[PDB]
Symmetry: D2
């Protein structure tokens, strides 16, 4: 049983609480698209763990590689190079767009955004950073200063020079021109304001191609390109945070490939490490050279460690080889259609959006009003878990609660169907 | 050979440089106290990789546990609990001093300091952080704002409210009272200044028990206690960063046990993960409860992941069971004596300091002047590597270069001797 | 002659340049609505000096009072009270709206905004300040941090927590809803953004009722009220900066009386001192009491000095007694009509706006496009001076250049006509 | 009577309190070294009003000049030049040391420090400012951020990059080397710390030659010079704030002349305006030229106003002509000797320091301990006023309360004696 008195006792006496609420179960095993509680009940993992496991849990290949380096080459002085590191850096230079040539191999997504941000400040000689008002880049210093969906209160000033602009949100547009949502004009209008507040020290704009924690908000047609132009125009770098969207999740190896827009620095983590703590940034040779000339420093314990690098290389291999980017589009499409079928069935489903296997479903009280359905979302989530489907809902003011659905890229056609079915049931039950 | 053209070619084309210089070799394997290059030459690892591997490389136990969880329970939604996590948190509550009750399991040392710092700001309702002028707490936002040994220039303002005070340094004292180094008066004098600059928002003082990157500077007799009193007096938390000193490295499980001073929050990482990316903070039940009441948030991808937690539990087990804390004192002592013998032999060795297996050797041009020996240190380091002994030297203005010697707690009596011998040779050669 | 070689020589060798360009003449005298150069040519002062002299130059009454206190009671220890000070404070409590009860008598407009801002931060326990993107509150620290029309570049970070929102500008609207300029929705939309960037420390919003330096932009119908509600809703004070609009300039004693909106703190200066350096802030008894309980400090050399206080009391007297507030409406109206007649004559006159004797005329290349007329404005200004009419034009990006026309409240019907006539001539000449 | 019910009623209902406590009397007139209450009692003004009136109250010459410009040329558009302005700027270029060539004519001491600070940041391209831990530069933004004797709490963060170092204080030294107060080593030691906290953006050090509000602390032999060298070494400007020490108060026209050290920018106000609100900064032609090339902006309402400029020129004239700088030394010396006689009489007088007519007397409980005499100082001050001698005491932690004695440079031999006599009586009464 999940009721192990001692377990929960120790849990209550000795864990720091760091957000949300702990799920009432005891996870004892995980395999493929499932985790299993202490009774052995299999729970369908519709969020790939914490939005990371693109290959599912305990993938045999990963298991092998892990084993292999744990026993042969694990951790090293940060000045010592090895093959897994150079291979990975090389692979990444190779599968990212042209213009992205050099990599730095770290441990977390926030760390990767801090590294990119420090690099941008260094090469521009400037310090103001601009993000989206619904962004999430991490819990550490600079990543947090640029995170606007949460975490800003009660902890003192953010970093000097932090600004945000509204993200382009087609489901709930607030900037109109000639009776239509002119998200490109909204962008211009936002920048002029920024321009006016700036001390003349704009260093970068940082952005998620699809804002996940912020409500699966996908940047619309042409937006990214226009954004890149705003930056170039101001001598600012554009850093694209692809912690969740990278590595195939949205049905392209990297989301920025979809818009055909190449950022100055690209950050990776969640899906790169597929569960393990490996992250990275990739930038141009020119930017890297200038950073280096300026003494760029970002020296950590695990930067360039062989085992994690070895792991991420295996991740890319598998993804490539098993055409998991394409599986994302097919299963993605399979899942979207189901969701839309549900939506056909239940009025509370106000919107189905996202791309590939990063989909969101927005719960509303009224389609005409798009009135958020207060607690209905939480209910559905509770029912899902009872039904054996692990889900996650995010909620910001002005928005219905949004389910973030992101199964492993290794997910089966059956698993999807199972998932869709458990979900309609949870919805039927929640009403 | 280490000369693999392609290797270095790819290395040059695709790695971001992040500090220092890459060692000219290709590391292909590692085992116990050694790593091996591409020719198969065994290099004696006198810094435990990046000051982490207390159990040495590829420890069989770690190898087993790793394997075991990689295949059974790897990574989870951050709201899902499991045994390795609760066990570890519990173990830590148990082996740390009384008053430290709840843990938060993260990935890196900087991340662990950011978590502690955010917690302190939250519970005090304040934001000013004070560290040592020769500190190193990491490369991310807040950890970096509190890092004074390096990284401050070229990257814009640090965090609002960052201050430093001089660390107590008995080898190069600068605060005199009645013909003697009154480091306690220096402390008082520093705080009064701080007090005068403060906006009345002092939240914490953060400190390494022994400043490593800063030159192996050990806080002297009674200092820590007095420091803790300064904080209490100001309603500030005291955060002790034991990334390197924790887990037995200095010959006590935790360095703060040595002074018998319990900090408000304790941070762990390098030695906790013993090579893998696992970090943690531990605080009191009261502080944790208040943080929680105030909405403490620090939600990451890998917080509470089973595999890493599983790994750190095995680390503690081994350390405990093999009495590696005591091995640190014995080997530590064996090594100190050797160093002192060298010092007897070579005038350039100006000081031998540190504790347990975290020792430093300061190179000088003149013992009377304590004039730094310009390049001599770098030379010795170069000779060591030729001689097959991997070493590391740190250098700050006003100080001779310092070797940071920190072999695995699993190091043999022979390995030490080997090390001492290779070192005297390198010194003989460098002169 | 204005060509005094020595004068200009010394001028060139010994004056720091602090913005704009020095006018090529030597002012030797001033009287009523004119100043006179070294040839004795009378220049019609259409900006009341630096937008201050509501009573015109060298007003006999002011001259008397000045004389009187210079010789009897001039300057005092800031802890010594006297009649002119208590009378003035009292007068102000009396002529400002209900709810504004206590005054602090200072020297400059920036100083008065710094005092109001410090007070707001103190009583809210918070520090973030929000202003308009085209504001001007002064050159000192906090006043400057809240000034967005200029001065932000090249001088390092502004104050922590500085934000701006776009001002409501009916002549060049950029926020549309249902085919119309919905400036109230623009306001809401701006605040939500602010809300999202805030660290939860909003202390005040500071605002000019009519943005002068920013282009004579008058807050439209209902805007102020809605603004006040935004603040109340967030527990923020509303500080109204009436440096130029106060004391009758816009045809009400205070502009905020026009909207019937009472701010938490009101600041005064330019027109209060009518040329002399006297400024003030006025707040509620409750706010003042709380500030005092919290140790409010703003102790300066000239706070509470008798002579300046004596001067401002005489200013209010005269204004009251000579019904100069009403003269502002009549002459104001006389002047607006003329301007509009011009506008009837010249296509370049794109807009005539403002209120009372604070009017603006926007120069454009095209009424349909509202294309700014590049240099045309500067030309007209140059011609005016030749014609003996001192004028001033302000120019921000996205806007035609704007003449700021603000003659003394003591201005004659003839002086206005003269002014209108000189202006059409300058325009005819400039084309 | 001073008991005018109505006066105090209005006083209580309508004055904002801004520090300290209001003196219980009603000042109705002032003349020479005295002010007179409502009963007509003459109070001997031992602080020259708020440390400003070097010529005493209502000086006939000032009265004439004031009158003259009030009626002929008062206030102007900030782009219009006139004689009083160019003459004054010229005079100042002329009486300040070589290397100080161009002036900017403002209104307050804080404003003058903000102007100097903005200029320094602009020309260095940097933003960190360093002051003394017991400084007072004003209540506005940057001046306040650099003020450490008071005002820092309850009002949010100071300006980014604010630092302080301890001032050299020979009466209460805390930095010892070889049994002696090595204030030069203290300076070095302070800077190294600063260096370590800096983001590499040191723009200026700002300093009072004698810290007044901070306790009449006179920089000792050679200190200033060494300070200037610290700045030059770091590419920082040195700004000397001579608001109180300038214009003859310390027995040289400017205190920096005494050490023969020329700062990059010199600020003036209190004594320059001698009671009226006039302030100024003076810098080198080179610095000014570079500021201008960089768009230096500091455009205010009263910058370059004729009347105030006219007043300060008359002040300098009188000072020069009446050899008031020398009167300061003679009367200063007369007063110091008296003070020392008192000190001979009363043990509570722990120290008599300062220079010229800017003297301080530190009250202690014990000369051996230098134990502050708690409330004794306040008592003496209360007795002085009863005795008809207006005085002022300042008190910081770690220090006895200090009387700041600074009579008009126009003070008579008799007035001094009167003052000394009233003071010994107050002391006799207070015990
Ligand atoms: C005391 C301490 N705390 C925190 C960190 C941050 O660790 P991480 O960068 O992995 O987040 C370090 C890093 N150290 C260097 C990397 P070195 O080993 O050279 O002293 C540290 O020494
Ligand atoms: C886009 C993005 N970048 C960076 C990070 C920081 O990752 P980390 O905290 O591991 O350093 C996250 C974290 N996400 C949440 C944890 P969620 O998965 O709930 O959206 C992210 O979503
Ligand atoms: C050295 C110095 N610089 C600048 C200022 C700011 O002057 P202001 O506030 O008029 O702008 C002061 C004020 N002083 C007090 C008011 P005190 O006279 O009590 O020492 C000062 O002492
Ligand atoms: C609305 C407002 N508030 C405060 C100030 C600051 O006044 P000061 O600089 O005298 O302290 C100004 C200055 N204005 C310019 C000088 P302009 O007259 O050109 O609009 C102002 O317009
Ligand atoms: K490493
Ligand atoms: K997790
Ligand atoms: K005063
Ligand atoms: K002026
Ligand atoms: Na690429
Ligand atoms: Na414990
Ligand atoms: Na009122
Ligand atoms: Na000079």
């Amino acid at each position: 049983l999940n009721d192990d008195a001692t377990f929960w006792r120790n849990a209550r006496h000795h864990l720091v609480r760091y957000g949300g609420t702990f799920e009432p179960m005891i996870i004892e095993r995980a395999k493929g698209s499932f985790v299993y509680d202490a009774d052995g009940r299999a729970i369908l993992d519709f969020t790939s763990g914490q939005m990371s496991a693109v290959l599912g849990h305990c993938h045999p290949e990963i298991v092998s590689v892990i084993g292999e380096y744990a026993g042969k080459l694990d951790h090293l002085f940060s000045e010592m190079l090895s093959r897994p590191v150079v291979d990975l850096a090389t692979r990444l230079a190779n599968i990212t767009p042209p213009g992205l040539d050099r990599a730095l191999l770290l441990s977390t997504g926030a760390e990767s955004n801090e590294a990119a941000i420090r690099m941008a400040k260094l090469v521009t000689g400037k310090y103001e950073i601009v993000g989206f008002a619904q962004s999430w880049h991490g819990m550490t210093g600079a990543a947090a200063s640029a995170t606007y969906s949460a975490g800003r209160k009660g902890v003192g000033p953010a970093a000097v020079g932090s600004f945000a602009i509204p993200a382009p949100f087609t489901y709930r547009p607030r900037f109109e021109r000639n009776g239509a949502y002119d998200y490109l004009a909204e962008l211009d209008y936002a920048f002029d304001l920024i321009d006016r507040q700036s001390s003349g020290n704009l260093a970068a704009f940082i952005a998620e191609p699809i804002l996940s924690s912020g409500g699966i908000i996908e940047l619309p047609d042409g937006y990214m390109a226009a954004l890149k132009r705003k930056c170039e125009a101001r001598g600012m770098l554009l850093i694209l945070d692809e912690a969740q969207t990278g590595v195939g999740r949205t049905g392209t190896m990297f989301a920025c490939q979809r818009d055909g827009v190449t950022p100055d620095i690209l950050t990776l983590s969640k899906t790169l490490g597929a569960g393990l703590p490996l992250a990275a940034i990739v930038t141009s040779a020119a930017i890297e050279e200038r950073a280096h000339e300026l003494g760029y420093l970002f020296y950590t314990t695990h930067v360039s460690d062989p085992l994690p690098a070895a792991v991420g290389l295996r991740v890319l291999d598998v993804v490539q080889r098993d055409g998991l980017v394409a599986r994302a589009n097919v299963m993605g499409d399979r899942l979207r259609r189901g969701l839309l079928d549900l939506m056909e069935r239940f009025d509370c489903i106000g919107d189905v959006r996202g791309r590939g296997l990063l989909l969101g479903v927005e719960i509303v009280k009224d389609r005409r009003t798009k009135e958020p359905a207060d607690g209905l979302g939480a209910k559905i989530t509770r029912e899902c878990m009872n039904l054996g489907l692990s889900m996650n809902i995010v909620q910001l003011p002005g928005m219905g609660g949004v389910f973030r659905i992101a199964p492993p890229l290794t997910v089966s056609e059956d698993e999807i169907d199972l998932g869709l079915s458990l979900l309609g049931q949870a919805i039927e039950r929640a009403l």
